[PDB]
Amino acid sequence: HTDLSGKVFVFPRESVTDHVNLITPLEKPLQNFTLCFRAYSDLSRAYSLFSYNTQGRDNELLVYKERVGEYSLYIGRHKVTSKVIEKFPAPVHICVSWESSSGIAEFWINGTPLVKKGLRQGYFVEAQPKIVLGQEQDSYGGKFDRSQSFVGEIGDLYMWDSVLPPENILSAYQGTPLPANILDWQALNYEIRGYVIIKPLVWV
Amino acid sequence: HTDLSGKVFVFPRESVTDHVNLITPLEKPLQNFTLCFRAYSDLSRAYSLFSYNTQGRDNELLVYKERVGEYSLYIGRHKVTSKVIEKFPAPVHICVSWESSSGIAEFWINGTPLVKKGLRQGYFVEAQPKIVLGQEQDSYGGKFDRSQSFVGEIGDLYMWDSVLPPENILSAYQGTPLPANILDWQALNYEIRGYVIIKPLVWV
Amino acid sequence: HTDLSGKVFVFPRESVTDHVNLITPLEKPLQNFTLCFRAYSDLSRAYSLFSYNTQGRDNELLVYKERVGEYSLYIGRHKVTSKVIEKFPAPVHICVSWESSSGIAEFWINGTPLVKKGLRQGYFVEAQPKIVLGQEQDSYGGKFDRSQSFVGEIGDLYMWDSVLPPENILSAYQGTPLPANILDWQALNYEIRGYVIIKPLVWV
Amino acid sequence: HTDLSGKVFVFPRESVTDHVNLITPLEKPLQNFTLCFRAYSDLSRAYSLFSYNTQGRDNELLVYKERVGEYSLYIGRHKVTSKVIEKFPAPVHICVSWESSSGIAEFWINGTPLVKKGLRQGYFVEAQPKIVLGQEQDSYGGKFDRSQSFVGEIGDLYMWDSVLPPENILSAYQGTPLPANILDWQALNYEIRGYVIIKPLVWV
Amino acid sequence: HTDLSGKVFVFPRESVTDHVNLITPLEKPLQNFTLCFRAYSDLSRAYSLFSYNTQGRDNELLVYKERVGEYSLYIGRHKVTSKVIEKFPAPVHICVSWESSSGIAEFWINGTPLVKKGLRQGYFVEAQPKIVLGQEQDSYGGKFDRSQSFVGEIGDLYMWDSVLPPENILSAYQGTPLPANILDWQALNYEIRGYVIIKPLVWV
């Protein structure tokens, strides 16, 4: 595993090939999670931010940007979307959490909460995922689509098996995240495929 | 009754099913009232914020959001509408009062007064209501319409049988409302139907 | 006469009936005047703010709002219009002066001077007027038009038989007008007709 | 012959007649000049700000406002135009200089330099002008065009037979110009023709 | 050579003739570079900012502005483009770096980083260039196009044979650039052709 403190993945061009695989030792289905990261892109078309598929299951956990100001979460193929005022282009800090017991999904953009939405109450997100940055999966680990590819920079990614309270979301946004047990930027197990370059983070 | 201080109702999806019934021992017709609450929604279509119907009478007291920047009050089916500059999406604090003797309706949005309008001078709002959050009634307690449903979060709801002066409206906006004798968020009698979740208020 | 300090006239609906007549013992033709008042309306269509007609003479002195950002003064049917950057909807303080000797008309909006214009140099505004708020006159006291009616609130109205200097306009904008000898909000002789309600001024 | 400190010319209406003739006793061709003045107009159509014609020569020196945000200088019938971000309507302070040796024209708007442009390198602006405010000349002292007329206010006009450096431009903008040798607001020889009124400057 | 500190090149008109040749003793192909400069133009159409061609190679290194808010870099005829929020017209400070080993191109506009893009990984930029300001080259030193010409002012140009870190980019932006070994504004060898004038820098 690798300490990526102070660094970003750069996906420097549009492709159907360039991606990073993220490896987690996650064998138990998820009832609760929070995912935070920073991104900087000047794409106006739609793109995937974080794609988690399991065997036989597309869009098992997907964070997707449909257009400026609109963020979508998919859980087990079902989707919710919330809106925010944002400048374009601009760096962003994105957190999203989901809680099975209520179905509530919370997006937080630059430390501000979006309107709560709900989906998949009682569901468990399936384990043994393939997790990809830079492309949107339609199969278990593949079937990418360049019109959904992420071109730009991603850093400071964390995933926890709990729903972070507001104080811990703000801490992540400020740069003092709680250590994370599913994915953690200070100890990330990743595989680069194609043209992805690791560079210093210069925009936070 | 339940003290919902620090909490909101979350209406997490569009539906014709999800709603909260609010119960108040209102047996005398209303001459004067003030209603305040906070709301956070990213709907662009029209929606009902507060629906009060009586037997045989639709839109006896209705607070309805036509579109961004436009707030309507219905009293006994008659309507007025006033406009305001607001960001979208954004949390809002809404107060509205009405006084039978003058017919004057006063909206206050985030502590700022809208232009006064007038309707139903001399009328008394009928008693024994069904009061619904989340859906717009067309019958006594029912006949909801998905395209008028509220999706988002509502909290800090208070209703008085008097017209509040500006200083008391500001107190409510600031989080220290005067005690309210029709509906009180700190002693609320309600019934959840369908998918409505109580969560902490994180956006004020 | 009545002291309306701290109060407004509310014209709560569109109509061809609702108006206030202002009474002044003006028997000598006017060579110079200044008129100040505050208004709050969310109409987008054209409307009359102050209508002064004399026997046989329509639009003898008329302050008219054709559209957002544009204020007109008519003197003996002739008009000038000046433009301003303003928010909509928003309360406004409006002063206008005119001087026969030069023909110069000065609008001040929220204490800011508009571009000077000129009309009717050498003319005298005729005496023995009927002065109306809420409607635009087409006869001596009447012939109103619903599509020109004022809906909203007017207060702090003063009229002087001289051209106020800038620092006196500012004093009026700040809520401390100098003594006024044609119309005076603190000793106003008026008649309400139709649906007009006096309420506290809550927006200044 | 007159000190206009604290005063403006008001051109109160559109016409093909109303203007001020400015008379300089300096009689010499111009190789270098700077011209500064303040203006306030709410016209959206094109208009002339300063028109200098010589016998048989149109547009010998012309400062012309094509549309909002665009200022043009003509030297000997040739033109340059530069752009600026400005609010509309708004008072403005305009300086423009031109240097024959380089051909460079410099506009400064409210103390801010526009992009330099170049024209007529080596040319001498002809002597013995008619200089007009309020109208655009097409002949020596005449052939005006109502659609190019200036409506509004002009004050604080100075013209020097040198190119002012930035510090002197700022001094003029701030109300402390260096004494000027072609035209000077504090010792101005002018002739009003038609409807032009001198009033105090109330907008700076 | 010449210290152009405090000065700019002014390209005062649209033309196919006016340009500056920049002379560098660069005989080894470039693997890494950073280029900074300040520009002020009110063109809305596309234009070239910095044109570097070699014998037999068009667009070997080209910095091009297609439209407001979009900056392009060509390396060996391949292009990348990144977007930024910017006012128009407005002075701008532009830096761009490129590193062959990763292919990463970094634009910085007014000291803020744009999204990184990548092109020509492993390529060497050809040596023995002709470098032109004011025009876009289509041959080795020539074949200009009026519709791509730069009209406006350029100064503070530096080019280094390395990729500058953020602190050194900010130093350039703030007016204390590090000495630069390919091109240096403080020791510049240049040739003016046509109508280009050197003037003080008045807009920084």
Ligand SMILES: *[C@@H]1O[C@H](CO)[C@@H](O)[C@H](O)[C@H]1NC(C)=O
């Ligand atoms: C899921 O998260 C919620 C909110 O923090 C918490 O109340 C609950 O205990 C969590 N459930 C599990 C199984 O961890």
Ligand SMILES: *[C@@H]1O[C@H](CO)[C@@H](O)[C@H](O)[C@H]1NC(C)=O
């Ligand atoms: C409603 O308000 C009016 C006007 O102030 C007041 O006179 C009246 O008593 C009020 N009605 C009730 C039932 O309190």
Ligand SMILES: *[C@@H]1O[C@H](CO)[C@@H](O)[C@H](O)[C@H]1NC(C)=O
């Ligand atoms: C109107 O104003 C002018 C100029 O100030 C003055 O000369 C004249 O006397 C005034 N007319 C009156 C007071 O009726």
Ligand SMILES: *[C@@H]1O[C@H](CO)[C@@H](O)[C@H](O)[C@H]1NC(C)=O
């Ligand atoms: C013209 O420009 C400047 C002074 O503004 C100066 O360098 C030059 O000598 C001037 N020439 C004349 C004719 O005064």
Ligand SMILES: *[C@@H]1O[C@H](CO)[C@@H](O)[C@H](O)[C@H]1NC(C)=O
């Ligand atoms: C280009 O930059 C990289 C930065 O690490 C460096 O390793 C390489 O030597 C550079 N090439 C040259 C020719 O300096």
Ligand SMILES: CC(=O)N1CCC[C@H]1C(=O)O
């Ligand atoms: C097909 C579908 O539902 N979605 C959601 C966004 C990505 C897209 C996809 O899986 O390609």
Ligand SMILES: CC(=O)N1CCC[C@H]1C(=O)O
């Ligand atoms: C029909 C009508 O007047 N109204 C008012 C707003 C919603 C709508 C309704 O009751 O459905």
Ligand SMILES: CC(=O)N1CCC[C@H]1C(=O)O
């Ligand atoms: C006819 C006319 O000139 N005007 C001016 C504005 C009101 C309108 C009117 O008198 O009805």
Ligand SMILES: CC(=O)N1CCC[C@H]1C(=O)O
């Ligand atoms: C004809 C021409 O070139 N111009 C310049 C602006 C005014 C206009 C004119 O002289 O009327």
Ligand SMILES: CC(=O)N1CCC[C@H]1C(=O)O
């Ligand atoms: C032809 C081409 O590829 N380009 C790139 C920008 C300018 C333009 C050119 O060389 O003219």
Ligand SMILES: [Ca+2]
């Ligand atoms: Ca998919």
Ligand SMILES: [Ca+2]
């Ligand atoms: Ca897909």
Ligand SMILES: [Ca+2]
């Ligand atoms: Ca209804």
Ligand SMILES: [Ca+2]
């Ligand atoms: Ca309905």
Ligand SMILES: [Ca+2]
């Ligand atoms: Ca009329």
Ligand SMILES: [Ca+2]
């Ligand atoms: Ca009329």
